[PDB]
Write an enzyme that holds these catalytic residues in place. Structure first.
Site, PDB file in Angstrom:
ATOM      1  N   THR A 125      -6.683 -18.296 -23.404  1.00  0.00           N
ATOM      2  CA  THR A 125      -6.679 -19.424 -22.481  1.00  0.00           C
ATOM      3  C   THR A 125      -5.702 -19.199 -21.331  1.00  0.00           C
ATOM      4  O   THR A 125      -4.614 -18.656 -21.520  1.00  0.00           O
ATOM      5  CB  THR A 125      -6.322 -20.742 -23.202  1.00  0.00           C
ATOM      6  OG1 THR A 125      -6.107 -21.778 -22.235  1.00  0.00           O
ATOM      7  CG2 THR A 125      -5.069 -20.571 -24.050  1.00  0.00           C
ATOM      8  N   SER A 126      -6.107 -19.611 -20.132  1.00  0.00           N
ATOM      9  CA  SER A 126      -5.261 -19.531 -18.946  1.00  0.00           C
ATOM     10  C   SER A 126      -5.403 -20.834 -18.178  1.00  0.00           C
ATOM     11  O   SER A 126      -6.515 -21.217 -17.805  1.00  0.00           O
ATOM     12  CB  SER A 126      -5.643 -18.335 -18.068  1.00  0.00           C
ATOM     13  OG  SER A 126      -7.002 -18.399 -17.677  1.00  0.00           O
TER      14      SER A 126
ATOM     15  N   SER B  84      -2.314 -18.054 -22.922  1.00  0.00           N
ATOM     16  CA  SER B  84      -2.064 -16.660 -23.273  1.00  0.00           C
ATOM     17  C   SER B  84      -2.200 -15.742 -22.066  1.00  0.00           C
ATOM     18  O   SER B  84      -1.556 -14.688 -22.015  1.00  0.00           O
ATOM     19  CB  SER B  84      -3.013 -16.221 -24.388  1.00  0.00           C
ATOM     20  OG  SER B  84      -4.367 -16.394 -24.009  1.00  0.00           O
ATOM     21  N   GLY B  85      -3.024 -16.119 -21.088  1.00  0.00           N
ATOM     22  CA  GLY B  85      -3.221 -15.316 -19.899  1.00  0.00           C
ATOM     23  C   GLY B  85      -2.213 -15.516 -18.793  1.00  0.00           C
ATOM     24  O   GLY B  85      -2.215 -14.752 -17.823  1.00  0.00           O
TER      25      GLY B  85
END
Lengths: 201, 196, 221, 229, 221, 188, 212, 195, 193
Positions: B1-2, B129-130
């Site tokens: 996810t970003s 996470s990105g």
């Protein structure tokens, strides 16, 4: 579970049902009793319980209690389908605290007249089959014997032979079973109970 | 996810990807991670899907009750509700939230609630996470006041890099613009941002 | 690192009066996924000896090739003397026990004709204990086949009608066709009740003439 | 050896009436980080063999160096090293399987799943699989890792049994392979948009296609999904 | 275990397989996985069968009471909210993974619910052990404009792929179609491609084969 | 550990109990009814607590009704108590033998109840490993029409076999007899 | 598994069952648990079947070599100690073995040694090793004397095996008997446990608790 | 912790930070992470210090023997020696190594060798814990055929961002330029890249 | 499990060893002793298999020395050799779990000697000793009744008292004991104990 042994098998014939079970009760390798019957009946519906013997006795007593109260309140004997639903609900009521049992229900509906068999998992999942239901520590052997031998629409005389042969041959390959067998042939109005002669006992 | 949210001159802009993965398998490729908790207050969620969805629903209910009783809640009020929910149940929740809203404070407002339930007010925030791969870039290409098109381009570049370098991020880029004119929703497909 | 795995097969060996039958399923799987629908596990190793190792595919293949090499070297070193089934069984026992501390994760069944011309089936355990038997099933469906064979081959728990269970049903000679029918029925039941069992049945028959092969289709074609 | 660090992705392959087709992407993932791109995972050996490797890429380089050494060794004192005594897919697969099993038996495995594809000298298509633990098997369609769960069901819709192999043309097989690669890029988080594809045909020979890209993807409907309720 | 849901221009379609197993042994070969929450809101479950059945029945009873209380047709969003809140309260211990389809006066809806309490929206969804093959089939052969026949065929093909490629799936296919403006259409055993085929022998024992010790009559009636 | 054995002969019930506690004069018995005795074995003083609780309940029933319970009802009550105990915190680790003479039917009865709550009612029974060393003799030298003296001799043989073939020294045995006149203790 | 062996005036009597089970499922009921080391030596199989078979065949080969070299039959003590020394090397490697080496020699008469995988080696008169060893040993102890005839000893072995099979769920598919004399072993056939139980119950009034 | 190597137009520039931490404590505030293997063909290492020092010493000895016996090693020879040392001791060392070199024929070469022993060439290379924060920026601002000053500026910006956003990375910024002219050493202090 | 007791009197050494070999009880007449030399005896206890092998190895070594040198090793030398072997084995791959008592009669000094050695390698020269848990039950009797100037009969009576106390106290049934006596005339075994 799987410390006392025991196997039950139910099959459906032509206008009749059959339910057979072993008689061994033991503490692991040691054999204790050869008369521990695992089949009970309330009204006209039969129930076989495999697994922990204490839980078998407790469930038998509780179901007799509930069936007697049902008869008193409704002035009518309970049918196999309603009893199956009641057993499933009672088993699911003990979620996360389940009884270590395998139940199998058999019987002929009084009104419709058709046979009915069903099985239950640990937490009361209903498995309804039109051919046969097996339970116990020798369920794989019972499955093999039933798949190889069972035929639809069998007369009670042939159904008794089929279920007896299946039970005996499955028990002969299981270490925790085979100290005597009892078979019930159930018809619309007549029930016959027979004891079988087998090895090791 | 970003996930990211940046304030500009006419308000605030929220951007997110659309990938939800169970281990190495992509369970969802059209995920909408932009959640509306009030008419001009939105949140971006990262972490456990169930926890974030439950927290968003509870915050939406609380803000609806606040609106029924008091009027128009501020973005700081929604951030405070999110902070209370995350901090009280920090031991049983995994949720990183970015609260972005446009109100009379103008120029938009962005609050960050990371793991642990803390609150930080920032001109722009990134999460997921990105985000780790686009930190330095976002520190070299951000300016306090920007127009709508420039902010959209900045979001597109940042999320394109995040999707490129992070295997947990992918899909389409979804953007929400909150201004005095209202709410605008923008979709950018992989054939567009994989180049710029 | 786990050096072992399971490929989920089922084999069966039956010894007749003048013949032997070794059958097996052809499905190779791993963790609910089908690697292959036709991966034979029963091989003709020579000298009218048919061998089948079930379980770990790599260990089974290694054991089969080692046994074939041993047969080749036995022919080389003893003036092409034919290897008897008991000698082959003892050699396979030594091969299995040579790596007892890192054992093959397989169950082995070999079949052939003995020195008198009668069917012989030898069963082995993973660490190298072997016995001669008349009917032996191995794999994940062994528990679903052996009681059926005991009832339909040895006529166990069966008595002559009208004697009230006083005279047992006498044993009768079974032709190769009857053994084939029993094997097919047992494998069909195993396919019905076992998820890992059933894509195709391969049967090898050993007689004085030699080794012959038959194939039949199962479910999940 | 004990755990992979830089890992490859799924390798897919199938047989058509005149040969084999094998494809694989070009990603060098480092866990959840797509660290390396442009990594060729299809190694051509001879004019008739293609080896596809999935998993640890350091071991991939080790065994491709082994393949180069084997090719060099086969030409020593061999006047017919290019006509009749040349390497074959069966020989290469046997050598690879022996090496993998020997590595497994020493508890020092090569963390790879390998598909060997080619055409034998007699015109028969060879396509076989090996991995760590030395497990080997063959099938008309093969796939390693993640592609074993998604690419195989689609490919088996075209080539379901052996008798279907003569009925499959090269165009249909290539289209199926491209569709499988597109699906894998749809649903695999460690996949890449770019991939390589090799075709081994008994008549034409070895055709290698690099720098291929996944195209004709569908994303328009994503405009209609909003929220989660 | 394979469950598939596909939306088409005039409603939704859901499909599932009819195999229920415990370990590698097939328990029920004609199990029903399509559970009816409301006359036009249906659901298919994966995971613990007892949990799925119990939760579906509880939510259905609650939604029936709500519909009687409000004098309005039930909405699948209410069922989704109840299910998600229940599962979140139990923190995934109730191992039910559901695909819920329905038609209400607001249109046709399709959602997926996980054990921990997370919900997803999509035009095509798959869940279970064979979910990867079904998802591959759905990704390969889906388009925005689908009639009822196209959606039914796509769902059936996905279920068939899951049956043929996943060991945990098999047997038959059940399909429920919502079709806004019409009654819900349930099709149990829509496809039956896995017959058993006749056996090679009849196994009817002669009467008197079994030895009987004692025979009595039970006063049960 | 501890040896508990019981034999039901044609008109009596004989119960043998080990006398060692790890004391040599330990009586592991409680008279539940003038015609019903129970022997217990297993864990620590939980056994004594359970036996006293059962005895108090049975005495209260007898006082209330002025009519003693049959051995079957007592065994069912004990089995229910143990089954309730196992499904709750602080279970009882007690294995019991119940020997009682039914006056209404004029018949001896013996019941074996496990700590989990399993009841069998064997003609002869034992708790622990003592079944391993004795059940052969009981399978060879037991008749349903034996007298009290024959049962005592059989129990003597079983006790001698236990002493000879068991590594654990259980320090003798104490023998009780339940019959029509009630409960007596054998002083041999 | 009971695998009893005892000594008497006529020599040695060895009695075994034939049941092998794995995970409560009966793998086989025709297992030969007596290993014929040579025409004059027998051994019993308990623990690991492969270890017993392999090392007792190796012991037979060693005894053959010893008799070839020394031109004299090897004693029971020497063979038992050879096996014990062989096993003691592999201790801690996971070998499981319990064996009774029984032999009748001119110098030592009838002799029975017990050797386990732990390295213990002891000479005795009566031995019972197995899951149901207790019942068979009790029967033997209750009905043993150095005065029995051959037929009485064979019946005693059959009765002990039957008791062990009846009271143990892991024992009993058949009964195998062997009689060891100074001229070697004599095999006395294989007797089904199921039929033997009914025959013993009919002849001797034992097993009254079982309905027949 | 933050290591980089770039080949622009006339050679190769390798840059690094100087922070060595034994946990949260900074053990060495100014460490030289750039190690010479040969006159040319030498770059920086990340990961455990002892393993990297041992590998560097072994590679230097091997390349000294190669120079003495067979001429002059190339960059790929040094990359292969590093790859062999890392791959044969895969379960024994955790280094992570970038190797940069210059020669007349190719004019600047870079090779990356992560954990596991694999080797890749690439036009530019980044490694270390801090490099995780500069993956996008380095991807957005790298061009082929740059001048020396542009390369210095690009390395300075990327390493400054890595130092700012990584706790365990950043003292001064050390750079080494390898071209046909020779070997040049450059140092940039915190007051320069922080502003 | 195994009871090994030793006492020393003015001119003799008395050793007592249990008979049970329970592991269910197999043998009740086991002699857990080996004759190292006509004046030196060893009693052993501990792990199964290790004890017999160690005792036979020690006996073979002592017999080989006696044959090579035509001379009998003194009890102190034999005890030192046994202790050295145990100390070497304690740090080997498979140590022996053996505890031993050595009873000898030095003819050069005409004096009995008793030594107690454990598997670790701790050797002690004591007037009396025990291996296992029998010490806890017999130490009171040995401390209260033993005298340096005692005869064989008094030592036998004290051993009988200790054995009776062990029977009354030990939860494990060791099933009797075998008693051996070492003196100037060699080694003898008593009967009807």
């Amino acid at each position: 579970s799987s410390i006392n042994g025991g196997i039950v098998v139910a099959m459906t014939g032509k206008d009749c049902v059959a339910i057979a079970c072993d008689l061994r009760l033991g503490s692991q390798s040691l054999g204790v009793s050869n008369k521990f019957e695992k089949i009970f009946h309330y009204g006209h519906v039969f129930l076989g319980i495999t697994g922990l013997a204490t839980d078998v006795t407790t469930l038998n007593e509780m179901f007799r209690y509930k069936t007697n109260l049902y008869k008193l309140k409704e002035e009518r004997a309970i049918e196999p389908e309603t009893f199956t639903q009641l057993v499933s609900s009672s088993l699911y009521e003990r979620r996360f605290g389940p009884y270590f049992v395998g139940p199998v229900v058999a019987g002929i509906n009084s009104k419709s007249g058709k046979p009915f068999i069903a099985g239950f998992d640990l937490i009361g999942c209903i498995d309804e089959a039109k051919d046969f239901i097996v339970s116990g520590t020798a369920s794989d052997q019972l499955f093999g014997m039933c798949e190889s031998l069972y035929e639809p629409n069998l007369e009670p005389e042939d159904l008794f032979e089929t279920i007896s042969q299946a039970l005996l041959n499955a028990a002969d390959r299981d270490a925790l079973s085979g100290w005597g067998a009892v078979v019930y042939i159930i018809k619309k109005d007549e029930v016959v109970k027979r004891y079988l002669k087998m090895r090791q006992d | 996810t970003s996930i990211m949210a940046v304030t500009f001159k006419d308000g605030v802009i929220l951007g997110a990807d659309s990938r939800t993965t169970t281990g190495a398998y992509i369970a969802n490729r059209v995920t909408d991670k932009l959640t509306r908790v009030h008419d001009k207050i939105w949140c971006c969620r990262s972490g456990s899907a169930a926890d974030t969805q439950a927290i968003a629903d509870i915050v939406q209910y609380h803000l609806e009750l606040y609106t029924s009783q008091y009027g128009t809640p501020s973005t700081e009020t929604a951030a405070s509700v999110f902070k209370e929910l995350c901090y009280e149940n920090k031991d049983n929740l995994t949720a990183g939230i970015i609260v972005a809203g446009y109100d009379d404070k103008n120029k938009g407002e962005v609050y960050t609630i990371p793991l642990g339930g803390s609150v930080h007010k920032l001109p722009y925030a990134i999460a997921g996470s990105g985000s780790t791969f686009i930190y330095g870039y976002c520190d070299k290409n951000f300016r306090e006041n920007m127009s709508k098109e420039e902010t959209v381009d900045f979001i597109k570049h940042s999320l394109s890099q995040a999707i490129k370098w992070d295997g947990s991020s992918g899909g389409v880029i979804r953007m929400v613009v909150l201004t005095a004119a209202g709410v605008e929703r923008l979709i950018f497909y992989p054939d567009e941002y994989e180049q710029l | 690192f786990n050096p072992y795995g399971d490929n989920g097969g089922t084999i069966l060996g039956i010894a007749g009066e003048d013949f032997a039958v070794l059958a097996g399923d052809t499905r190779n799987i791993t963790d609910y996924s089908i690697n292959s629908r036709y991966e034979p596990k029963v091989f003709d190793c020579g000298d009218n000896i048919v061998m089948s190792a079930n379980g770990f595919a790599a260990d089974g293949d290694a054991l089969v090739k080692r046994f074939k090499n041993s047969v080749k070297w036995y022919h080389f070193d003893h003036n092409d003397k034919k290897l008897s089934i008991n000698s082959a069984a003892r050699n396979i026992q030594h091969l299995l026990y040579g790596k007892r501390f890192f054992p093959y994760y397989v169950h082995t069944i070999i079949a052939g004709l003995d020195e008198d011309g009668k069917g012989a089936v030898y069963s082995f355990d993973p660490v190298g204990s072997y016995e001669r038997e008349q009917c032996r099933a191995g794999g994940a469906a062994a528990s679903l086949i052996m009681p059926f064979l005991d009832n339909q081959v040895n006529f166990k728990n069966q008595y002559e009608p009208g004697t009230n269970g006083k005279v047992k049903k006498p044993l009768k000679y079974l032709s190769v066709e009857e053994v084939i029918k029993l094997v097919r029925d047992s494998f069909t039941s195993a396919t019905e009740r076992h998820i890992q069992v059933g894509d195709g049945l391969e049967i090898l028959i050993v007689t004085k003439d030699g080794v012959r092969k038959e194939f039949y289709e199962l479910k999940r074609d | 050896t004990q755990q992979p660090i830089v890992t490859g992705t799924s390798v897919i392959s199938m047989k058509y009436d005149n040969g084999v087709i094998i494809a694989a992407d070009n990603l060098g993932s480092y866990g959840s980080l797509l660290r390396f791109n442009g990594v060729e995972r299809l190694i051509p050996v001879g004019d008739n063999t293609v080896v596809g490797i999935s998993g640890d890429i350091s071991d991939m380089q080790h065994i491709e160096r082994l393949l180069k050494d084997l090719v060099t060794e086969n030409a020593y004192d061999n006047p017919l090293a290019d006509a009749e005594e040349a390497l074959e897919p069966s020989y290469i697969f046997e050598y690879l399987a022996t090496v993998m099993y020997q590595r497994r038996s020493k508890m020092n495995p090569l963390w790879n799943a390998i598909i060997v594809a080619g055409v034998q000298s007699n015109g028969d298509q060879f396509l076989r699989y090996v991995n760590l633990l030395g497990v080997t098997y063959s099938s008309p369609t093969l796939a390693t890792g993640f592609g074993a769960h998604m690419a195989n069901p689609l490919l088996r819709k075209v080539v379901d049994r052996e008798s279907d192999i003569p009925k499959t043309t090269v165009q249909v097989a290539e289209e199926a392979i491209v569709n499988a690669m597109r699906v894998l890029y749809y649903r695999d988080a460690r996949s890449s948009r770019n991939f390589s594809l090799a075709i081994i045909d008994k008549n034409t020979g070895l055709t290698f296609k690099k720098n291929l890209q996944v195209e004709n993807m569908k994303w328009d409907f994503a405009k209609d999904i909003k929220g989660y309720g | 275990t394979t469950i598939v849901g596909v939306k088409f221009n005039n409603g939704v379609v859901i499909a599932a397989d009819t195999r229920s197993t415990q370990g590698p042994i097939v328990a029920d070969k004609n199990c029903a996985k399509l559970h009816r929450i409301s006359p036009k809101i249906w659901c298919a479950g994966a995971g613990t069968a007892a949990d799925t059945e119990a939760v579906t029945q509880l939510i259905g009873s609650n939604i029936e009471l709500h519909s009687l209380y409000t004098s309005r047709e039930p909405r699948v969003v209410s069922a989704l909210q109840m299910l998600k809140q229940h599962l979140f309260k139990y923190q995934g211990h109730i191992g039910a993974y559901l695909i819920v389809a329905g038609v209400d006066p607001t249109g046709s809806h399709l959602f997926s619910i996980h054990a921990h309490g997370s919900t997803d929206v999509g035009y095509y969804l798959s869940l279970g052990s064979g979910s990867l093959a079904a998802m591959a089939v759905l990704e390969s052969h889906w388009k925005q404009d689908l009639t009822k026949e196209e959606a039914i065929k796509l769902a059936s093909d996905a279920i068939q792929a899951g049956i043929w490629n996943d060991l945990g799936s098999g047997s038959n296919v059940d399909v429920c179609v919502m079709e806004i403006g019409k009654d819900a259409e349930y099709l149990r055993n829509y496809l039956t491609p896995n017959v058993r085929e006749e056996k090679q022998k009849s196994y009817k024992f002669p009467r008197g084969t079994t030895a009987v010790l004692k025979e009595s009559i039970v006063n049960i009636c | 550990m501890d040896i508990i054995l019981g034999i039901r002969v044609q008109d009596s019930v004989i119960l043998a109990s080990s006398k060692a506690v790890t004391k040599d004069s330990d009586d592991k018995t409680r008279q539940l009814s003038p015609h019903t005795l129970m022997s217990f074995a297993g864990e620590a003083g939980d056994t004594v607590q359970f036996a006293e609780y059962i005895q108090a309940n049975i005495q209260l029933y007898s006082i209330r009704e002025d009519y003693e319970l049959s051995p079957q009802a007592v065994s069912s009550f004990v089995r229910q108590e143990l089954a309730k105990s196992i499904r709750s915190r602080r279970p009882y680790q007690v294995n019991v033998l119940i020997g009682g003479y039914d006056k209404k039917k004029n018949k001896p009865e013996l019941y074996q109840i496990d700590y989990l709550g399993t009841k069998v009612e064997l003609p002869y029974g034992a708790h622990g490993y003592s079944g391993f060393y004795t059940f052969f003799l009981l399978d060879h030298h037991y008749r349903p029409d034996m007298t009290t003296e024959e049962g005592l001799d059989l129990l003597k043989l079983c006790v001698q076999e236990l002493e000879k073939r068991m590594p654990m020294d259980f320090k003798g045995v104490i023998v009780k007899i339940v019959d029509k006149d009630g409960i007596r203790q054998v002083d041999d | 598994t009971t695998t009893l062996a005892f000594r008497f005036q006529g020599g040695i009597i060895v009695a075994v069952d034939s049941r092998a089970t794995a995970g409560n499922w009966v793998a086989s009921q025709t297992v030969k648990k007596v290993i014929e080391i040579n025409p004059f030596l027998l051994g019993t199989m308990a623990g690991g079947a492969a270890d017993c078979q392999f090392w007792e065949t190796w012991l037979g080969s060693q005894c053959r070599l010893h008799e070839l070299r020394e031109k004299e039959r090897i004693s029971v003590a020497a063979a038992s100690k050879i096996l014990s020394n062989l096993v003691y090397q592999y201790k801690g490697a996971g070998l499981s073995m319990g064996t009774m080496i029984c032999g009748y020699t001119r110098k030592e008469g009838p002799t029975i040694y017990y050797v386990d995988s732990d390295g213990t080696r002891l000479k005795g008169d009566i031995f019972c090793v197995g899951s149901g060893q207790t019942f068979a040993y009790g029967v033997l102890d209750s009905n043993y004397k150095w005065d029995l005839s051959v037929e009485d000893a064979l019946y005693l072995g059959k009765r002990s095996i039957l008791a062990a099979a009846h009271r143990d769920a892991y024992s009993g598919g058949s009964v195998n008997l062997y009689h060891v004399t100074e001229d070697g072993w004599i095999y006395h056939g294989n007797h089904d446990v199921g039929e033997l139980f009914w025959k013993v119950k009919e002849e001797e009034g034992s097993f009254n608790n079982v309905i027949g």
